[PDB]
Amino acid sequence: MVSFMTRLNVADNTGAKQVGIIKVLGSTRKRYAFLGDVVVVSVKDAIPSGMVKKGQVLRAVIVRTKKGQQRKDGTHLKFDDNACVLIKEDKSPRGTRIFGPVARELRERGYNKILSLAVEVV
Amino acid sequence: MEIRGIFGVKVGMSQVFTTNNERLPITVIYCEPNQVAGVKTEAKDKYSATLLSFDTVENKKLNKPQQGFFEKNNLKPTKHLQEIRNMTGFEMGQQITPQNLFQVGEYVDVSAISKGRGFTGAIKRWNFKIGPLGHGAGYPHRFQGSVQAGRGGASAQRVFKGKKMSGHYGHEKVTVQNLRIVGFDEANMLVLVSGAIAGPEGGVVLIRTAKKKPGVVKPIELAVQTEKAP
Amino acid sequence: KKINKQALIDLVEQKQLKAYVPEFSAGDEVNVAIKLKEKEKVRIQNFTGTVLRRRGKGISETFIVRKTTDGIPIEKNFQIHNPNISIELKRRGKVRRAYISYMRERSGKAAKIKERKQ
Amino acid sequence: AVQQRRSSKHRRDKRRSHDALTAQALSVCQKCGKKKLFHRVCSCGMYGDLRVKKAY
Amino acid sequence: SYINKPGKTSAWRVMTVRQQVSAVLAYGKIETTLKKAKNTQKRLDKLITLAKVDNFNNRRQVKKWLLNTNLFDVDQLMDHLFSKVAPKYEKTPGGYSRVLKLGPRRGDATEMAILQLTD
RNA sequence: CAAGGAACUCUGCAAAUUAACCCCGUAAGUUAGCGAGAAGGGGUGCUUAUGUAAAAGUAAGCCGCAGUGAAGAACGAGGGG
RNA sequence: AGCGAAAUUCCUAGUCGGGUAAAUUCCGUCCCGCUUGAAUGGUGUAACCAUCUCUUGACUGUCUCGGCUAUAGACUCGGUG
RNA sequence: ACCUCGAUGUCGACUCAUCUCAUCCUCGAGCUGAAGCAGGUUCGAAGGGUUCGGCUGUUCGCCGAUUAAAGAGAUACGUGAGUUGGGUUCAAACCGUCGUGAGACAGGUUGGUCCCUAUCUAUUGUGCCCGUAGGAAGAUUGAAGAGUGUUGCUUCUAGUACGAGAGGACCGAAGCGAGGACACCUCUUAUGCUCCAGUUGUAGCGCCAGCUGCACCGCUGGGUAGUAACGUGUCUAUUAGAUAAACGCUGAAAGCAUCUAAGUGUGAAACUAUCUCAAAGAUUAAUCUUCCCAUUUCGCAAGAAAGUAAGAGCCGUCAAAGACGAUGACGUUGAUAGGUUACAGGUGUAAGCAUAGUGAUAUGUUGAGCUGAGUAAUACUAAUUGCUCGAGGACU
């Protein structure tokens, strides 16, 4: 359960090494963000040859969590790091490739482009 | 309305896998055949109810007034007696089992006595917030919360009745509604009920027709494992 | 009127147990074929990896499988007696404990379990 | 906190009304007759028909 | 409040049962408190039933409980237990020890109890 | 004490990290003395053999999730009054 | 002369730049400095400080958010009081 | 300047909130310079909700990102016998300014002791006595009450209604959530001080091996039962009645008109119920069922001497319970607790022996050994052969 002002990694090609959460979008006092949740974030560690600049406030969706979540069948999916990919208003990823594995929770809440651009879904 | 009720003893909780790929936690209830000990009619009594007898025991473990009542009514001696409101349509002295009462997957609600917990504080009882632990503190850390309403003759000057403070917690009747029956076991007289049931294992449990959804029956079927042997 | 609660609990669990249920210890690498259901049909998706733990008694028997994709290690908790799930033991390995937590700390050449077991 | 008014000699006895004592249940030994409090070994160390301890 | 007494710690509790069990095995009677007698009975019975086979493994197991007493050392208590006491209870289905209640102490009013080996 | 890691608060108060020995490496500034244990890293167990007055060390092998296996040992960088 | 929104600036949370998603605090600079200023010394300054102030890495129950365990109390019995 | 100077602790923050409506959101309606969407204003409505941060001691305030919304106030500008002391306002020190000076400044800055074991009442829980007019054991009705009531997004309806176009519905249905609440431990985790294993130092068991004491439970990795959430089940619906604002139909006073005067309707998260809990000390003390009393004499009758039962209590073993009472199970005609047996779960192949190696160590016996609470049988041990209280219901 990624929470407010949590530094996590970006699994895409956009020039952003460390990103910090600002608000857990969706409701009032939404405590946590699980897989598939959308958040507003700020780039804190970036690169010179990157589309984003350090200090920009942007919108992201989370794809991995260290705590993990449990599915309906009883399977518990658990990664080792919290990761998000940069998305646009239309819900399309900002990067041109996706690094690492991605969850299946994206498929229910749209996000078809991220899955098709991913390496392998879990 | 047409309220159906049964009594049983909770033996534990398990899970079953179902078709549509869901893992459903279930509670297992041992339900003895219940005996209708009395029927009370609207015309003769001013209300309508059905009183059954369950949890049978030997006659030497029962008191004299109760065994006299049982022998006068020609019933099996039981140490537990309770009724449900608005239960009609059953003849006195008829054995009733949940199979004739509820369907395979209909919605029911369940009432049971909660697990006793004793004298608990305000935070564990009323979901209160704990005071700060660092940055300097005082003797009361697990504080209940200031009960001041007004100081002075023009104000209450008293803690208002029904305040939220420490006291007894547990051993109290509670009802959980809209629980779907999962399976019936006639040979073992065993009812499978989805979800979690209040009370310790072995306590009494009342299963009644849900007032929120009286006639709603959501289908549920289990999964057959096709796993072939080696 | 003595009530053996576990016998009744065992019976409800027996209603849906499996026949084979192949065995595996803590440090084993298995191949788990998930029978994922789409709108139609099934895509058999393999989750081959290393076991990390096996807890439970009956229908609640669970095991932990750890995998590594693109250098990212992912751990996934399966239920043994769960339909649409198939387990196939591949390599039997030697470990000195039941819950090898250090595998989620050791990685690379140091995350390889020697074969053989007794 | 301390009483701003002194408690009379009547409220004091009302509170002590629940301080009364209870007589412990006693029984008779089946070999010597002296009264002993119930469910306990007598002074001779003879409980029921079993010689427990040596005589006082 | 600080500089409190160490208290009835778990280590103290294990040592108390150990001390009492060694004495009741040496002499045959113990005059203790009822709540302490009700706790030594479990360890006393468990020791006796494991000492019914008289193999060297059982001696190592028993030695984690016995302590030196006045009438016997730690090595003759081993012989006394394994050759005199335990062989007597060869077919008794448990319940080798009995706890009975004495009167209250004059200076504490705590309920005393005698723990003995039931012949 | 899981996930997060100062979001708490007047303030990282308090608590937490480091901690012994040995081997590498160590900047700006300066009154050239310092800064400096700077920063940043690595090794430590047991056995055999070689080493010595004793070592330290060296080579091979073995075990454990972890080897000053427990106790006692410095948290750090930058700017300003 | 030097320094200057200062332990000094009332107006004032002064203008601008930097630090932050966002900065009455901080750093640099600007100068109508109401009322700075040269042995009640002025301006700099390496090292040092259980000094004050600000940013930051690791770190953690400070916190989101509370939970469990063990003692000594509290609570029950006997004695003093 | 009326109370208080033989003492009413004063800002802000934290915890707990309660109340009012002059309503921020949700709900209903009239008008619109209301095409639709989104608005503006007024009326009705207080059931619920009404975010997190940066700077400042701050209230306030500006800014950032969300939300359906980030309402206005009162309660000693609520709340220190509840917490803190950052600010103000003690003694210390310095700057600017005033004073010849000691000193001063709603000018600035650094530092700087916040006590009390609750008698009454109020409240949260739990008991004893007595009453309920014979006693006791059960099952009830419900007078008077308490608790909850929040809402969003997506899809369909439907690119339909409207609109040159752009854009884009009311009504209704389905799915998925956030917060809050109740319960539970199958799953995921946290804890799990008489559990298992590994392991260091030292002192002991005369030595090796193997154990014990101590070192935060010595440390480390797991972990039974129990306790919990970060976990998963459920609730946060619906309906009926009487209505507020508003709209009416039929209708005159006032031949027209007119919602009203008679009569008859519609109408909101507000009210009364439906939902959950508790409830006959409700002294206005209720109802039903069952069981036990129904002696011999003397005289005096809700009189005596003895004499008659259901049941309850004392005591013991306890835990579905629990501060102590109480609640619940049992007390030899018994499975209440311990022990034994078997098993589950947990830990991870025990000691010893044999082989191999020069040795540390590995391999086989061996999924072995061990195990606090867990499951079920088994009277082996402890619940003794005991004591006390307790009934004839006045009359109308």
Ligand SMILES: O=C(N[C@H](CO)[C@H](O)c1ccc([N+](=O)[O-])cc1)C(Cl)Cl
């Ligand atoms: O004297 C005190 N309070 C007095 C009582 O007479 C009174 O309550 C008071 C409080 C605050 C105050 N003030 O903020 O100036 C003046 C008097 C306390 Cl300092 Cl003990």
Ligand SMILES: [K+]
């Ligand atoms: K005064």
Ligand SMILES: [Mg+2]
């Ligand atoms: Mg103090």
Ligand SMILES: [Mg+2]
């Ligand atoms: Mg404290």
Ligand SMILES: [Mg+2]
């Ligand atoms: Mg008043």
Ligand SMILES: [Mg+2]
């Ligand atoms: Mg008045």
Ligand SMILES: [Mg+2]
């Ligand atoms: Mg008197």
Ligand SMILES: [Mg+2]
């Ligand atoms: Mg008293």
Ligand SMILES: [Mg+2]
């Ligand atoms: Mg110790």
Ligand SMILES: [Mg+2]
């Ligand atoms: Mg943590």
Ligand SMILES: [Mg+2]
């Ligand atoms: Mg972390």
Ligand SMILES: [Mg+2]
């Ligand atoms: Mg804050």
Ligand SMILES: [Mg+2]
């Ligand atoms: Mg802050």
Ligand SMILES: [Mg+2]
């Ligand atoms: Mg400190």
Ligand SMILES: [Mg+2]
């Ligand atoms: Mg330096």
Ligand SMILES: [Mg+2]
């Ligand atoms: Mg300067």
